[PDB]
Amino acid sequence: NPYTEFKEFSRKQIKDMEKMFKQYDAGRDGFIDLMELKLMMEKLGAPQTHLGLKNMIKEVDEDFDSKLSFREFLLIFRKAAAGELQEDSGLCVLARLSEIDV
Ligand SMILES: [Ca+2]
Ligand SMILES: [Ca+2]
């Protein structure tokens, strides 16, 4: 339940993040993998290097399967709002360029 874990976000914000997550999960498997993340960053207008994509995932990949669950996607926005993302890092750019202002 993301609504009890991520209290810093409104329901509308979480739903918007859910909508974006689902947009880029091309295979409907419930995850964003590296290839899917590559495509998302391309379509946001800020393509990332292969290693940069890997490092983006690694920062929030709590179950070490090299792909992002919806919970881990939310962790990106939590980190952005906790002041923990490095200036102009891939994750910072993702959070900025999404329509979601946390
Ligand atoms: Ca997927
Ligand atoms: Ca994972």
From Swiss-Prot:
A cellular-component GO term for this protein: membrane raft
Positions of post-translational Phosphotyrosine modification: 3
Binding-site residues for Ca(2+) 1, renumbered to this chain: 25, 29, 36
Domain EF-hand: 12-47, 48-83
GO molecular function: cadherin binding; calcium ion binding
Function: May regulate B-cell receptor (BCR)-induced immature and primary B-cell apoptosis. Plays a role as negative regulator of the canonical NF-kappa-B-activating branch. Controls spontaneous apoptosis through the regulation of BCL2L1 abundance.
Protein name: EF-hand domain-containing protein D2
Origin species: Homo sapiens
Residues of the full protein shown: 81 to 182 of 240
